[PDB]
Design a protein around this nucleic acid. Structure first.
Lengths: 131, 129, 131, 129
DNA sequence: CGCCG
């Protein structure tokens, strides 16, 4: 349902290691070389940008194992979903607002955490977000 | 400071990819082998056990680059704590009481978020904390 | 680990409907036509017979969809594993010897069946089949 | 003899692909839509319920080409039974009393198998039967 | 043929 090259961009944009930015396009062709796999740079920019789709079977597996997730992510439409909630969670785990909030709601009791997370839903409701 | 032995297991148990659990000791060795570098599972496992210390400037590199972090993690005591925060977060959060709410907090304009911070303090205060 | 074209031939050879023989090559390009998908017949024959490998993402999706199994079979090695035991199985429920055996051993009690299984294992032992 | 709506559920329940359970009624009409043919889940479910009978000549064929069986399955009352055998067959097996037993028998030379077919009787004789 | 530039 979601195009390949978008499935792909999601990856660079979300998966990447602690204490640094996300993976550049070339970090990947280089790391892919050092593991003994040729890939064009412009075939990567092409795939990534939408300019070409329907890549090789292995061309997917090559990238899937660079970010260290199964190649099914691209092929299997099920596992995609099962794993999509996830990247949404990383991207959430980085946003600084959510952070400052949770750090303070930590040390907070069970009933009391509720009243908090309800206030959140009234502001969501009242933002035209949850309406 | 902290035994490198423990600084390694930090990584092992905090940094892993999405959609799965922590990295097995052998995943590592085999991955190294893939890159063309070579190390022994007995050595590695020995390092984490703590029956070997002071590792090669080269093996430290071969680890820090498979974990895609800086090697100064193991050597520098500053970048270490400064990047240990970054993990310290990654953990405290995957807790549950907070998972639910942190999820619903995302996307509130940073104006509205404020009102939630103030809200929280109300309760903080109400429990004497 | 197992090549693609053999993953495929396994499909042709095992999976097919009751009362009839297996799916021929053309049956598939035709049923593929009427579902509104072009594919070259010699591109099939090539793929099947190893003449060409590393097919498109979608080229796999189509054939997997024809036999009604998940396309992840071709890509993800794990699931393929998990699903192979299965085809091996139906290759079993067609062997006629196994049938005429099972339809006899049906109706026997709990430890009589066991005493049977053991005999099977001693003939297997004694065939140079089991070690 | 036997009904139609029941001959249909026969198929639904016995005939499916590997690695999963039986087909949903919707999977069907949607698959048909794919082929380019049209049918209403209310009609289908209605046919299976038994609130409709005497299906169109070409709804019967729209169904039997989806299950990839012969449409004569629905009409002919002999070949129904003949190709029912092949069904009542797939089933008696999946029951795992015999699953285990049946796996080990494959590959035994058609000679050795015989020796198993006879042991079976020693036992059968001892019970009954 | 079609995937890889």
């Amino acid at each position: 349902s979601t195009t390949f090259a978008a499935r792909l961009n999601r990856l660079f944009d979300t998966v990447y290691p602690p204490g640094r930015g996300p993976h550049t396009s070339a970090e990947v062709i280089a790391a892919l070389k050092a593991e003994g796999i040729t890939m064009s740079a412009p075939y990567l920019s092409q795939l990534r940008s939408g300019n070409r789709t329907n890549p090789s079977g292995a061309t997917m597996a090559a990238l899937a194992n660079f970010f260290r997730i199964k190649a099914a992510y691209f092929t299997d439409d099920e596992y995609y979903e099962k794993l999509d909630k996830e990247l949404q969670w990383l991207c959430t785990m980085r946003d600084d607002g959510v952070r400052r909030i949770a750090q303070r709601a930590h040390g907070l009791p069970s009933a009391a955490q509720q009243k908090v997370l309800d206030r959140i839903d009234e502001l969501r409701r009242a933002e035209g977000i949850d309406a």
